[PDB]
Ligand binder design. Structure first.
Ligand SMILES: *[C@@H]1O[C@H](CO)[C@@H](O[C@@H]2O[C@H](CO)[C@@H](O[C@@H]3O[C@H](CO)[C@@H](O)[C@H](O)[C@@H]3O)[C@H](O)[C@H]2NC(C)=O)[C@H](O)[C@H]1NC(C)=O
Ligand code: NAG
Ligand code: NAG
Ligand code: NAG
Ligand code: NAG
Ligand code: NAG
Ligand code: NAG
Ligand code: NAG
Ligand code: NAG
Ligand code: NAG
Ligand code: NAG
Ligand code: NAG
Lengths: 164, 317, 216, 49
């Protein structure tokens, strides 16, 4: 918590590269939030970045399979908090495995989690599907010789309960 | 947006006063979470229409059709086509307002559009319905022409002309997007409206709403509890009304974006995974094919259509 | 039968309708809970406010409750209007799907389920509709060599329906979605141009059904 | 964390997935009151001395 000459508020003060004019006492961001201050005794410019915060999300398989969970602290470092730093946040409790698989619990920024054989929670960069290549060539065509009839189910809501 | 940090950030007395309003903040957080989830559903529905990731061969002999301006450029750092690079280069957390990463990052979305392009190019529309069945591109176009009432022979007899017209038209797309600032207004408007909504929401913290000061600590540092609570309730009402306005506007805009995403998913299904016969659905003319490209917060389709150009007056019966 | 097993086994199959019920229930449950909130008032129960305070101040606390509860209703109604717009969009989609998939055979790709649409069946469901979309999916395929055209007398014959395929030694013409080779004849192909324009034309023999009859 | 998830979802059964259960903050450690340097001190000298 800082009080620079009646300007008040919580944050982390760090050494800045900003060049205030001799008479300006505090830098303000685009939307009128204080971004930097002049320390009144040593006339140096400090940036104010707000104190780290974010949601805490619990990544779990179901309580029908396991009571082991991983916790994601969103959009922060793994210093303020088997710890895996991801773009989505700091993931604690999941193991990092490089081989990709289909996303099971999405975490974010490409990272998904799952419960796999240990039999532990893992995190990985999701696979988008099995890779393929169509054996293209200028004189070759693939033609089906057999077929299946499939039935798919499309479920749509039509109405709400008529509350009055 | 963290309603309790936004309204009553780092103030216990204010938080205790906010708790007298019951479910308003949990409801706002729930609505914003629902929107945030929906945006990943929107991206999934638009782009994850292919189960497998298809690739074109190293041989690019497609009968004269030059797709090098839509196909990924391996040389660059993020495997994007040049047109995708123009689109990305052409589009421009404090108080509890934070931004979540999208589930599918730009590289994965580029991979999905690459899979859709390789599928379209090497198997026509068959990768959409079932197994992706290879067919030579000039034969795919022969089907695409036959699909609009033009006999196959028109492509084959005019194949070189058609391939050159296609390549020229894509180059013109490159120039059109490159030189005109306004081509991507539809996505820039979305970015701008969200930025304006959040700058307005943040600026609302500076309003008094009838209170002696917009700064919560300056009320707490000046006034004794029985009256500072009155001023703080005034600020809570104003700031909660500001969040309700923001969230309602976000819900309505999200409904608009959902409609756009549903249209984009329909267009990818019917224009990219097939050959639409819906007039002006897949651009003016008679639809032959279309190509997805990723773009920040949206999708750009290149619709390739047959337009009659020179005509003659015949007597008929 | 698989649809019956699929829908029964996983309970989540109908989440798209269950969510709607849940959201409406949550929408009302929150609203009912909002009656217990004070909104700054001395008590959330109106009858104790009227029974405890004299009019000039009880009216102030009651106005406080009126603002809080009216704003709560405005929130509920706004959320219901937006949710109703979502449901209206779903209902319009369902009516379109009923028109185009059930009352017809859609040619809109993936409108009426993956594959190639054959037909659909509605089934009712609480607060919504479930469609069983019956589609044709090609399932086994083979690699054939192909050609855009064939040369027979210097004229180019192009298939009238389907494509030319080769099983390695012989050329056939076949319907594009199902391997069914036919002998290439003048009733399967049409003639346009000649051999020196088409890129990829291959030499072949086209059978003329009339000649055997004229000799016979 | 698992009990927090159960309380958030009001259930003794939690389905597979990711649920937001709380909000982490980094609490202010020191209250720093730093102010300008002290100059133009009042002429109590004359009166007193
Ligand atoms: C009236 O005059 C007297 C003496 O001239 C003042 O008293 C003096 O006050 C100063 C205040 O800074 C004292 O200085 C001290 O010096 C020591 C070491 O020299 C240092 O460690 C301290 O931190 C402090 O700076 C000084 O000792 C003291 N002298 C006496 C005899 O009291 C008095 O302050 C004057 N009147 C007013 C109203 O100031
Ligand atoms: C206050 O005193 C310090 C000595 O520690 C000095 O360096 C500083 O310059 C003074 N304040 C100003 C505004 O100069
Ligand atoms: C999940 O729960 C069902 C009953 O609800 C049970 O039959 C099943 O065994 C559980 N799953 C596992 C992996 O045990
Ligand atoms: C914060 O995270 C970044 C990477 O996201 C890392 O480079 C940096 O060292 C971290 N800092 C702290 C203090 O943890
Ligand atoms: C892949 O995983 C192994 C652990 O088995 C690890 O040593 C290696 O560094 C990982 N590769 C990368 C690129 O992180
Ligand atoms: C086609 O598939 C069915 C089962 O899906 C099988 O019974 C039938 O023999 C197959 N036909 C051919 C020609 O392979
Ligand atoms: C057209 O294709 C050729 C390869 O056949 C390639 O070298 C050329 O760069 C392509 N055109 C453009 C504008 O890239
Ligand atoms: C057809 O005839 C009309 C006469 O009314 C003329 O205006 C038009 O230019 C003619 N079209 C062409 C293609 O010459
Ligand atoms: C067609 O041939 C390619 C290689 O020439 C092969 O990868 C592919 O599996 C073949 N198609 C089928 C249906 O086996
Ligand atoms: C057969 O193909 C050759 C090309 O190698 C061509 O010169 C010849 O004219 C073709 N035969 C007929 C009957 O067109
Ligand atoms: C191709 O089909 C013909 C039918 O006329 C048959 O005689 C020939 O043996 C077949 N060849 C192969 C490789 O299947
Ligand atoms: C197909 O490409 C090959 C080279 O891979 C070339 O020799 C051949 O002439 C081409 N055929 C057609 C029909 O384009």
């Amino acid at each position: 918590n800082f009080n620079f000459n009646g300007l008040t508020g919580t944050g982390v003060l760090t050494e800045s590269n900003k060049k205030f004019l001799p008479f300006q006492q505090f830098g303000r961001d685009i939307a009128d939030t204080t971004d930097a201050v002049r320390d009144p005794q040593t006339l140096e410019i400090l940036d104010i970045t707000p104190c780290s915060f974010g949601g805490v999300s619990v990544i779990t398989p179901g309580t029908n399979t396991s009571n082991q969970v991983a916790v994601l602290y969103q959009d922060v470092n793994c210093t303020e908090v088997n710890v895996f730093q991801t773009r989505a946040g700091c993931l604690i409790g999941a193991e990092h495995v490089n081989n990709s698989y289909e996303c099971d619990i999405p975490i974010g920024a490409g990272i998904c989690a799952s419960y796999q054989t240990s039999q532990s929670i893992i995190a990985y960069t999701m696979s988008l599907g099995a890779e393929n290549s169509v054996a293209y060539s200028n004189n070759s065509i693939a033609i089906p010789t057999n077929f299946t009839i499939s039935v798919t189910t499309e479920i749509l809501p039509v109405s709400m309960t008529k509350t009055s | 947006v963290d309603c309790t940090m936004y309204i009553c950030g780092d103030s216990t007395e204010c938080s205790n006063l906010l708790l007298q309003y019951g479910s308003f903040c949990t409801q706002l957080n729930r609505a914003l979470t629902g929107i945030a989830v929906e945006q990943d559903k929107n991206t999934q529905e638009v782009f994850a229409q292919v189960k497998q990731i298809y690739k074109t061969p190293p041989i690019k002999d497609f009968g004269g059709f030059n797709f090098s301006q839509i196909l990924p450029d391996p040389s660059k750092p993020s495997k994007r086509s040049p047109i995708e690079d123009l689109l990305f280069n052409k589009v421009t957390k404090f108080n509890g307002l934070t931004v979540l990463p999208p589930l599918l990052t730009d590289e994965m979305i580029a991979q999905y559009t690459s899979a859709l392009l390789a599928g379209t190019i090497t198997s026509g529309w068959t990768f959409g319905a079932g197994p992706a069945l290879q067919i030579p591109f000039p034969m795919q176009m022969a089907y695409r022409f036959n699909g609009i009432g033009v006999t196959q022979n028109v492509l084959y007899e005019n194949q070189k002309l058609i391939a050159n017209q296609f390549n020229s038209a894509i180059g013109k797309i490159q120039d059109s997007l490159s030189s005109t600032p306004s081509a991507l207004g539809k996505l820039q408007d979305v970015v701008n409206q969200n930025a304006q909504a959040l700058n307005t929401l943040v600026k609302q913290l500076s309003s008094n709403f009838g209170a002696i000061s917009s700064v919560l600590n300056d009320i707490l540092s000046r006034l004794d509890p029985p009256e500072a609570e009155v001023q703080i309730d005034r600020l809570i009402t104003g700031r909660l009304q500001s969040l309700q306005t923001y969230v309602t506007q976000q819900l309505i805009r999200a409904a608009e974006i959902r409609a756009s995403a549903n249209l984009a998913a329909t267009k990818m299904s019917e224009c990219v995974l097939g050959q639409s016969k819906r007039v002006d659905f897949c651009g003016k003319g008679y639809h032959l094919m279309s190509f997805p490209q990723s773009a920040p917060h949206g999708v750009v389709f290149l619709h390739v259509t047959y337009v009659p150009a020179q005509e003659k007056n015949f007597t008929t019966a | 039968g698989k649809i019956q097993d699929s829908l029964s086994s996983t309970p989540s199959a109908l989440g798209k309708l269950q969510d709607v019920v849940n959201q409406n229930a949550q929408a009302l449950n929150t609203l009912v809970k909002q009656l217990s909130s004070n909104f700054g008032a001395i008590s959330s129960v109106l009858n104790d406010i009227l029974s405890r305070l004299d009019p000039p101040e009880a009216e102030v606390q009651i106005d406080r409750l009126i603002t809080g509860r009216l704003q709560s209703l405005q929130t509920y109604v706004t959320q219901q209007l937006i949710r109703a717009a979502e449901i209206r969009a779903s209902a319009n989609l369902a009516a379109t799907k009923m028109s185009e998939c059930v009352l017809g055979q859609s040619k809109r790709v993936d409108f009426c389920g993956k594959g190639y649409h054959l037909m659909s069946f509605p089934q009712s469901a609480p607060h919504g509709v479930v469609f069983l979309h019956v589609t044709y999916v090609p399932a086994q395929e083979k690699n054939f060599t192909t050609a855009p055209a064939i040369c027979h007398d210097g004229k180019a014959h192009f298939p009238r329906e389907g494509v030319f395929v080769s099983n390695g030694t012989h050329w056939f013409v076949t319907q594009r979605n199902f391997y069914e080779p036919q002998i290439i004849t003048t009733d399967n192909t049409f003639v346009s141009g000649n051999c020196d324009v088409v890129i990829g034309i291959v030499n072949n023999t086209v059978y003329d059904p009339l000649q055997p009859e004229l000799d016979s | 964390p698992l009990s927090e998830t159960k309380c958030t979802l009001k259930s003794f059964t939690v389905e597979k997935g990711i649920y937001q259960t709380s909000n982490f903050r980094v609490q202010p450690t020191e209250s720093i009151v730093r102010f300008p340097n002290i100059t133009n001190l009042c002429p109590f000298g004359e009166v007193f001395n």
